[PDB]
Every structure is written in structure tokens, then in C-alpha cells.
Paper text:
Recently, a shortened Dscam (sDscam) gene family with tandemly arrayed 5′ cassettes in Chelicerata species has been identified, which encodes ∼50–100 isoforms. Chelicerata sDscams could be classified into two subfamilies, sDscamα and sDscamβ, containing one and two variable Ig domains, respectively. Crystal structures and cell aggregation assays demonstrated that both α and β subfamilies of sDscam used Ig1 for the isoform-specific trans recognition in a hand-in-hand manner. Furthermore, the cis interactions were established by the three FNIII domains of sDscam, which assemble into a cross fold with a kink between FNIII2 and FNIII3.
To elucidate the molecular details of trans interactions of sDscam, we determined the crystal structures of Ig1 from Mesobuthus martensii sDscam isoforms α1, α7, and β6v2. We also determined the crystal structures of sDscam Ig1 from another chelicerate species Limulus polyphemus (isoforms α7 and β3v7) to provide insights into the conservation of sDscam trans recognition within Chelicerata. These crystal structures of Ig fragments were determined at 1.3–3.1 Å resolutions. The crystal structures of sDscam Ig1 from both M. martensii and L. polyphemus revealed a common assembly of antiparallel homodimer for both α and β subfamilies of sDscam. More interestingly, in some Ig1 crystal structures (M. martensii α1, α7, and L. polyphemus α7), the two protomers within a homodimer were related via a 2-fold symmetry axis, namely, these two protomers had identical conformations. This implied that the homophilic trans interactions of Ig1 were also symmetry-related. Similarly, sDscam Ig1 also employs the ABED face to form an antiparallel homodimer. However, among the seven Ig1 structures reported here, the complementary electrostatic potential surface pattern (negative in one end, neutral in the middle, and positive in the other end) has been only observed in the three β isoforms, but not in any one of the four α isoforms. Structural analysis showed that B and E strands constituted the core of ABED face and dominated the trans homophilic interactions of sDscam Ig1. The residue preceding the conserved B-strand cystine always interacts with its counterpart of the other protomer.
Author numbering: -1 to 98
Write the structure that this text describes.
């Protein structure tokens, strides 16, 4: 089989508190099934109230339904299959917080 090559994902460059984010972790090559693991600054992401994961054997979407300052940081997707692994980290930066 072939090892996976991750497709980079990135957060928006103008994140505002209370808005939403979605990023897709996926591979351009690599035999299925793929397995996905998400961490935010080394923490289990999904246990954040406002973070939901949508995961199948092909891709995993990380959803932040309401951005809060606690979500600022680095999000790492680790991807593997029986033949290799890959990883990508994307930083979430907040441009505008709650003001009113």
C-alpha cells in the first residue's frame, strides 16, 4: 500500500469571537481506511463544548460552532493508514473578540 500525504488546512485570517470555523483534514493519496486524531495544544479537541468532529474513513472535519478565546491555539490533525502517517498543524488566531 501507499502511505498518506496530508492536504494542508488553515483557519480564516479574520476570526471573530462568536463566528464559526470548519477545517477538513484529508489526504491527496494513501490507501483507505484513514484514521484521524485531532489535538488542540495537546488537548483532546472534541471535549470542547463548541467543537464537533465529523469523521469517516476518508476525511475528518473539525467544526467550531461558536468561536471563543479558549479556542485560540494550534490544531493538529494526525492521519494514518496501515502504510504510513502524516501530520499538519494550523493556528487559530482571533482578530476581534466579544466587544458588546
Amino acid at each position: 500500500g501507499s502511505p498518506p500525504e496530508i492536504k494542508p488546512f488553515y483557519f480564516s485570517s479574520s476570526v471573530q469571537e462568536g463566528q464559526r470555523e470548519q477545517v477538513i483534514c484529508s489526504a491527496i493519496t494513501g490507501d483507505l481506511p484513514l484514521l484521524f486524531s485531532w489535538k488542540k495544544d495537546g488537548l483532546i479537541v472534541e471535549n470542547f463544548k463548541d467543537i464537533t468532529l465529523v469523521t469517516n474513513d476518508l476525511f475528518s472535519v473539525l467544526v467550531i460552532s461558536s468561536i471563543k478565546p479558549e479556542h485560540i491555539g494550534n490544531y493538529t490533525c494526525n492521519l494514518e493508514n496501515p502504510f504510513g502517517s502524516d501530520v499538519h498543524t494550523a493556528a487559530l488566531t482571533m482578530k476581534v473578540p466579544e466587544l458588546s
